[PDB]
Design an enzyme around this catalytic site. Sequence first.
Site, PDB file in Angstrom:
ATOM      1  N   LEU A  18       0.765  -1.526   0.334  1.00 37.75           N
ATOM      2  CA  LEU A  18       0.273  -0.299  -0.041  1.00 37.75           C
ATOM      3  C   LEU A  18       0.530   1.467  -0.100  1.00 37.75           C
ATOM      4  O   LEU A  18       0.194   2.831  -0.370  1.00 37.75           O
ATOM      5  CB  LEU A  18      -1.111   0.511   1.455  1.00 37.75           C
ATOM      6  CG  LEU A  18      -2.348  -0.806   0.798  1.00 37.75           C
ATOM      7  CD1 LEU A  18      -3.900  -1.040   1.763  1.00 37.75           C
ATOM      8  CD2 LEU A  18      -3.244  -0.647  -0.076  1.00 37.75           C
ATOM      9  N   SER A  58       5.016   2.734   2.178  1.00 38.59           N
ATOM     10  CA  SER A  58       5.845   2.505   2.718  1.00 38.59           C
ATOM     11  C   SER A  58       6.512   3.441   3.534  1.00 38.59           C
ATOM     12  O   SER A  58       7.121   3.475   4.917  1.00 38.59           O
ATOM     13  CB  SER A  58       7.309   3.061   1.584  1.00 38.59           C
ATOM     14  OG  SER A  58       8.539   2.511   2.306  1.00 38.59           O
ATOM     15  N   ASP A  85       2.925  13.145  17.314  1.00 39.92           N
ATOM     16  CA  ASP A  85       2.881  12.758  15.363  1.00 39.92           C
ATOM     17  C   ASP A  85       2.068  13.590  14.999  1.00 39.92           C
ATOM     18  O   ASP A  85       1.446  12.968  13.200  1.00 39.92           O
ATOM     19  CB  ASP A  85       3.951  11.127  15.069  1.00 39.92           C
ATOM     20  CG  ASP A  85       4.177  11.466  13.445  1.00 39.92           C
ATOM     21  OD1 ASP A  85       4.179  12.657  13.036  1.00 39.92           O
ATOM     22  OD2 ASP A  85       5.063  10.688  12.876  1.00 39.92           O
TER      23      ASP A  85
HETATM   24  C1  LIG Z   1       0.382   3.839   2.462  1.00 46.43           C
HETATM   25  C2  LIG Z   1      -0.749   4.536   2.451  1.00 46.43           C
HETATM   26  C3  LIG Z   1      -2.106   4.180   3.122  1.00 46.43           C
HETATM   27  C4  LIG Z   1      -2.481   3.423   1.600  1.00 46.43           C
HETATM   28  C5  LIG Z   1      -4.247   3.106   2.733  1.00 46.43           C
HETATM   29  C6  LIG Z   1      -4.729   2.553   3.856  1.00 46.43           C
HETATM   30  C7  LIG Z   1      -3.223   3.447   4.428  1.00 46.43           C
HETATM   31  N1  LIG Z   1      -3.338   2.360   5.904  1.00 46.43           N
HETATM   32  C8  LIG Z   1      -2.511   3.082   6.607  1.00 46.43           C
HETATM   33  C9  LIG Z   1      -1.442   3.410   6.895  1.00 46.43           C
HETATM   34  C10 LIG Z   1      -1.081   3.613   7.743  1.00 46.43           C
HETATM   35  N2  LIG Z   1       0.747   4.021   7.964  1.00 46.43           N
HETATM   36  C11 LIG Z   1       0.509   4.605   7.109  1.00 46.43           C
HETATM   37  C12 LIG Z   1       2.640   4.995   7.817  1.00 46.43           C
HETATM   38  C13 LIG Z   1       2.878   5.475   5.828  1.00 46.43           C
HETATM   39  C14 LIG Z   1       2.612   7.035   5.247  1.00 46.43           C
HETATM   40  C15 LIG Z   1       0.922   6.725   5.459  1.00 46.43           C
HETATM   41  C16 LIG Z   1       0.402   6.414   6.775  1.00 46.43           C
HETATM   42  N3  LIG Z   1       0.429   7.592   7.890  1.00 46.43           N
HETATM   43  N4  LIG Z   1      -1.851   3.453   9.304  1.00 46.43           N
HETATM   44  N5  LIG Z   1      -2.390   2.961   9.155  1.00 46.43           N
HETATM   45  C17 LIG Z   1      -3.669   2.104   8.233  1.00 46.43           C
HETATM   46  C18 LIG Z   1      -4.669   1.528   8.235  1.00 46.43           C
HETATM   47  N6  LIG Z   1      -5.135   1.267   9.453  1.00 46.43           N
HETATM   48  O1  LIG Z   1      -5.676   1.481   7.348  1.00 46.43           O
HETATM   49  N7  LIG Z   1      -2.140   3.298   4.273  1.00 46.43           N
END
Ligand SMILES: CCc1cccc(Nc2cc(N[C@@H]3CCCC[C@@H]3N)nnc2C(N)=O)n1
EC number: 2.7.10.2
Length: 265
Positions: free
Chosen positions: A15, A17, A124
């Site tokens: 999804l 990184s 954050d």
């Molecule tokens: C990857 C981008 C992305 C696209 C779609 C769903 C998600 N889901 C998450 C991402 C995340 N952390 C990422 C970590 C990397 C940057 C973006 C985001 N903060 N934490 N939780 C979820 C979730 N529970 O669905 N992340």
Amino acid sequence: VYLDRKLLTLEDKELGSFGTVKKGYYQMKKVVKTVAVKILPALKDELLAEANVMQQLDNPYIVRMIGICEAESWMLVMEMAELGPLNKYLQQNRHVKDKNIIELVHQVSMGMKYLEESNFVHRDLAARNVLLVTQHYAKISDFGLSKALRADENYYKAKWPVKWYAPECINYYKFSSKSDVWSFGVLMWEAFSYGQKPYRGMKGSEVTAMLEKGERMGCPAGCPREMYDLMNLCWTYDVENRPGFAAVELRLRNYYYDVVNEGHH
Ligand SMILES: CCc1cccc(Nc2cc(N[C@@H]3CCCC[C@@H]3N)nnc2C(N)=O)n1
């Protein structure tokens, strides 16, 4: 809290990184639940500390952890917020209306008011760490920097997201829910700017200097003045005079109802 690798099916597609975020499904007692899985010395302990925070939280505006699994690497399994991070969502969907932006930032403030009540500091809080379940449902994620406050203190004393940090974080290494309020100001600025990054073209050191001159980012084109006024309130230099999230959430809650009213009119 410890999950069974057998019951987790991960997709090959990343999804995005710590490592990677993959999509997966986890077999529960009956339903399958779609999940977002963070996949990885200091990095393991950090993952585990993050899971330890999330274990403690239970709020409709905060991403729920399903649990942790030690398999190919350590994995942190969370409910999936399908539409992903708010900043990427608004960059990709510039038609989202201001009433809908207020809704989502108000949901974030309800989640933060809960984190404040619970005496955790996020550290954050940024539009990248706000995840969308739908276009009308935001939840806060990414607790890797988060701290539970000691019973006797109202701040935590410490590679930082400086553009989101309050002056006392930079000057004194002190992090409170009021410093999360400063960040929630920058997050709002992001949200009303189609998800653009703050303090465009500036290094962190120039940001701190700007802010010490009493300068603040300008109002985003088309942003309601009441929202920009609230951003400015979050960016109160003096922590003691900065509002907490109870005050913030009440302000957004009332403005949101005003806007919903004008809309029915
Ligand atoms: C990857 C981008 C992305 C696209 C779609 C769903 C998600 N889901 C998450 C991402 C995340 N952390 C990422 C970590 C990397 C940057 C973006 C985001 N903060 N934490 N939780 C979820 C979730 N529970 O669905 N992340």
